[PDB]
Every structure is written in structure tokens, then in C-alpha cells.
């Protein structure tokens, strides 16, 4: 279930060449690599990582001979990444003065996978190239190179300083050389040859890579799915398999409380003490303590033994349909829980796949949804939610989101604003906010494509909490005397709106400031 990853970094002279204000492709690539290794180290993934550098001053690789595979160094052999590898990216690895053949480097990387995976058992094989393509190269036996990648089942991902208005901001939302242009076409051809038309999507810019999880895309562990049955009435039972589509990714590791001198968990102990609520408190016996519940004013003694027998006994795990209603009746404001389930058709079952497909399309065409009852097991508490259609070109499924019970709902009354004489804005005030929304719009529409383009897709940005934690964890591990470092600028750049949105908003914001008076109490 582990993956063999080889990171192929260009350290050539041209990677060090920087344009004022813009970070050198070498420093950019270093930041992307550190981002990758930090996740693999601190998330304690069992994936083995190797590191090959091309354009080094010296030559240290198994294919090195005469003029073949020159200026390529195998910095790290295939093994679980550690703090020593991270320390090397941070300060040990320096840019070189020579230039190497990126295809020669790709072969060295391929040779690493072929020889170092002999003993071990890997589910996925992956190579990540980080280059500027400014260096000269040979197309000799390229057709075989592409073929061997297919035969060995090794995937590729390219990372360039450029991607396929205003100022440059790394992580934010002049002219490529003829050698880079020539190099790019071979990269395109190779990617199309490996992953088809959609292969071009696997060529990223260093900047966008920092604000995406694309570096892990190919070595990402498959989602755990579970089977159940969708039951319309009693006689009909469609065989399904649902998994958690959305689930909040939270911090895995916990901060263990240790003594300041010894630095051990064992020396610290938590003990519970019991005392009476009445005046002049006395110690209460740990064995004599009985479970109880409040019923308003009354205090009812109810033991765990009697509770298990008298409690609500669920009829069992199911995905039973209660009824069907129009799309308009189910409002997003009533969605509940901490997950989204995608109800897919049972794997290796053709008849159940058509049976679910019939329901998906019937609900879509009629503009209707399905109110269903859900429980993962017989012990679990029952839920009532919406099951709505979701049809895309490649896949077809129902989407389950939990809905509320009467007890969950809260009813408050808020003052009307539509015709409030005291708070009604003037025609000039409304026309000022109208200009603000037009200036601060996060979407662009091309009339030829007639498709709406999002300029701030947040769902693509990774949670800054993790890479910030990893930064601090690594900094304390390598530099214990120094205090915590500040948040990296690229993390702030990816969280803030595009510079064009910020610049456009300047003029209407100053206008709404004067028109709308605001003061503290």
C-alpha cells in the first residue's frame, strides 16, 4: 500500500538566475520539495522517497560513464524520509554551475525505481521532475523511454517556473526561451503519450504547486468505501456502496504533557477526586457513585445497566427511502452533520448500477430529491437526510447530506430590513455598494466559451494549519535555541484575493467609507 517516489530536481546554473522581485526557480523548487517531504515526514506516511539532482558540479549515479549521464547525483536513495533529508533540502543542497540533460536525469530516476524496489513491495511508482527546461537535451531513444515508463507502471508530474497583468507573488492566484519552448514540446508530447489528452494537467508551475495538493495526487491513499442497500419500499433493494466525499481533515498527532526538567509522560499522573456538593464537603466513595439524569426540576436516578435495556433499539443499518419531494423544498441552510456521502453503485455489479442510474436520472429530470433514513450500524443513532442526484461526464451518483430533527431547530425573530425607515440606504449609497460588488467580483466570463471562470477557488487551496505546523515542528527540531519562525509569505499570498481584485476595490472602498458612517459605542 506504499509508493516509491523519486524527486528529480534541476540544480543547474540557470535555476539560480533570478529576475528582481521574482524568486529563482531553484529557491521556488526547494520550497515545493520541502512542502512535499514535510507532509510525508510529519504525517508519518510509509511511502519511500529518493532524491536525484541534475546539473550538479560532480557526477554520482550508477549509469555514469564517459559522456553518458554526466552531472547527475543520486542525493538520497529510496527509503522512508527523515529530518536529515529535510535538513539537506534546507541547507546542505546548493545550486550547481553545470547543466544536465533532463531526459538523462529521468532515466537515472527510472533506474533508481527499477533497482531499489527489488526487495520491497510498492503499489504505486512515481517520478516528479522540477526543472526550468533552459538546458539542452537529446531526443535519442525517447520512444523507448516513454515505453519503459508504461511497462514499469511509473507516473510522471512536471514542475516548471512558468505555467502552461500585475506583479509576481509566489503562491498567489516576460518571454520563454527558444530552448525552453523546444523542451516544453517534448514534455507535452511525453505527458500526452502517458496519460492521454488530460496528461497536460500534470504539468504545474512552482507557485500553483505550493497552493495545491497535486504533489500527493498520484501517491494519495485510496478512500475506504463501505456497502449498504437503498430500499424503496420493501420489495425493491438497490445494492450500493457509499464513502465519505467531504470529511474535515484534522490534526492526527497530540501534544503529550511532559515535565520541564525530565521531559517524560510517565512522571505526570492525572487523578480524580470526589466530594459532596453541600456545605462542609466530605469525600464521596468511588464504588457508591450511581448514574443519574435531570428531568427539569426533578432528579432521576438511572443506572447504565437499566439504560441499555430501556434505551432506543435501532432496527439496523439501512439506506431506506422515506419519500420524494421537489429540489426547492430542501434548503442548504438545514444541512447537518460533519460529512457528505457519495452513494455510488456496488462494485462489479452491472444490474445494481443501472437500477441506481434510473433513480439518479428520474430525480434530475423531475427536479426532485429523496428523503432517506440512514445508519452505518445497528448500534449507531438513526439519521434523516437528503439524497440528491449528481451527474458528471465520467461518474454518476447520489449525494447524501443529513437533515435536521424538530429538536435540532431553533426559532428566533429578527427585525425586518426591506422597508426599515431608520436603516434604509440612499440611492447614492446603494449605487456605491453596486460598484463595490462589480469591482470585487471573484469570477470572469468569456463570451466565446460562455463558461464562468472562478478566480479564487478556495476548495483547491490546502488548509494552512498543517504546513504551518510542519514548518514550526521542523524549525524546533533543527534549530532548538531559535524561537518559532513567522508564517511564510507564500502561505499569506495564497490566502489573500488576487492582486487585481485588491487594486480594483481601492477606489469604491474609499467611496463607501465616506458614504457609510461608522462609529464605536
Amino acid at each position: 500500500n506504499k509508493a516509491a517516489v523519486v524527486l528529480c530536481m534541476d540544480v543547474g546554473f540557470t535555476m539560480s538566475n533570478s529576475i528582481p522581485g521574482i524568486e529563482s526557480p531553484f529557491e521556488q523548487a526547494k520550497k515545493v520539495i520541502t512542502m512535499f517531504v514535510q507532509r510525508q515526514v510529519f504525517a508519518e506516511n510509509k511511502d519511500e522517497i529518493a532524491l536525484v539532482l541534475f546539473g550538479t558540479d560532480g557526477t554520482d549515479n550508477p549509469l555514469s560513464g564517459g559522456d553518458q549521464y554526466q552531472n547527475i547525483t543520486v542525493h538520497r536513495h529510496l527509503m522512508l524520509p527523515d529530518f536529515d533529508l529535510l535538513e539537506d533540502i534546507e541547507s546542505k543542497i546548493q545550486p550547481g554551475s553545470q547543466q544536465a540533460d533532463f531526459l538523462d536525469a529521468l532515466i537515472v530516476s527510472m533506474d533508481v525505481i527499477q533497482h531499489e524496489t527489488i526487495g520491497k513491495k510498492f503499489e504505486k511508482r512515481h517520478i516528479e521532475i522540477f526543472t526550468d527546461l533552459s538546458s539542452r537535451f537529446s531526443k535519442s531513444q525517447l520512444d523507448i523511454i516513454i515505453h519503459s515508463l508504461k511497462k514499469c507502471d511509473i507516473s510522471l508530474q512536471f514542475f516548471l517556473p512558468f505555467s502552461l497583468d500585475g506583479p509576481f507573488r509566489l503562491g498567489g492566484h516576460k518571454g520563454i526561451t527558444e530552448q525552453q519552448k523546444e523542451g516544453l514540446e517534448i514534455v507535452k508530447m511525453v505527458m500526452i503519450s502517458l496519460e492521454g489528452e488530460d496528461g497536460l494537467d500534470e504539468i504545474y508551475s512552482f507557485s500553483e504547486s505550493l497552493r495545491k495538493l497535486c504533489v500527493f495526487k498520484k501517491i494519495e491513499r485510496h478512500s475506504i468505501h463501505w456497502p449498504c442497500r437503498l430500499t424503496i419500499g420493501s420489495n425493491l433493494s438497490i445494492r450500493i456502496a457509499a464513502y465519505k466525499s467531504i470529511l474535515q481533515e484534522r490534526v492526527k498527532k497530540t501534544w503529550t504533557v511532559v515535565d520541564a526538567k525530565t521531559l517524560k509522560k510517565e512522571d505526570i499522573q492525572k487523578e480524580t477526586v470526589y466530594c459532596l456538593n453541600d456545605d462542609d464537603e466530605t469525600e464521596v466513595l468511588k464504588e457508591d457513585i450511581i448514574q443519574g439524569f435531570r428531568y427539569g426540576s426533578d432528579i432521576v436516578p438511572f443506572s447504565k445497566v437499566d439504560e441499555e435495556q430501556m434505551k432506543y433499539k435501532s432496527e439496523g443499518k439501512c439506506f431506506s427511502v422515506l419519500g420524494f419531494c421537489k429540489s426547492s423544498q430542501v434548503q442548504r441552510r438545514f444541512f447537518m452533520g460533519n460529512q457528505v456521502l457519495k452513494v455510488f453503485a456496488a462494485r462489479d455489479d452491472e444490474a445494481a448500477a443501472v437500477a441506481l442510474s434510473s433513480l439518479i436520472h428520474a430525480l434530475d429530470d423531475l427536479d426532485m430529491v429523496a428523503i432517506v433514513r440512514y445508519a452505518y450500524d445497528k448500534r449507531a443513532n438513526p439519521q434523516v437526510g437528503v439524497a440528491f442526484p449528481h451527474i458528471k461526464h465520467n461518474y454518476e451518483c447520489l449525494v447524501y447530506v443529513q437533515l435536521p430533527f424538530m429538536e435540532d431547530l431553533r426559532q428566533y425573530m429578527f427585525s425586518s430590513l426591506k422597508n426599515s425607515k431608520k436603516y434604509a440606504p440612499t440611492e447614492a449609497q446603494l449605487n456605491a455598494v453596486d460598484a463595490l460588488i462589480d469591482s470585487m467580483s471573484l469570477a470572469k466570463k468569456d463570451e466565446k466559451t460562455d463558461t464562468l471562470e472562478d478566480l479564487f477557488p478556495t476548495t483547491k487551496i490546502p488548509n494552512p494549519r498543517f504546513q504551518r505546523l510542519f514548518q514550526c515542528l521542523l524549525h524546533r527540531a533543527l534549530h532548538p535555541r531559535e524561537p518559532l519562525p513567522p508564517i511564510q509569505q507564500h502561505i499569506w499570498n495564497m490566502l489573500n484575493p488576487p492582486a487585481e481584485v485588491t487594486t480594483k476595490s481601492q477606489i469604491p472602498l474609499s467611496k463607501i467609507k465616506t458614504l457609510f458612517p461608522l462609529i464605536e459605542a
Binding site: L63, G65, I107, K139, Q141, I144
Partner: peptide, 12 residues
């Protein structure tokens, strides 16, 4: 002219 290449024995 194009630079000749010697592929690793396993590729051939």
C-alpha cells in the same frame, strides 16, 4: 548532429 544514448540494460 544528435547526441547518441546508451540506455540501461533493463530498458533494452
Amino acid at each position: 548532429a544528435e547526441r547518441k544514448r546508451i540506455l540501461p540494460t533493463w530498458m533494452l
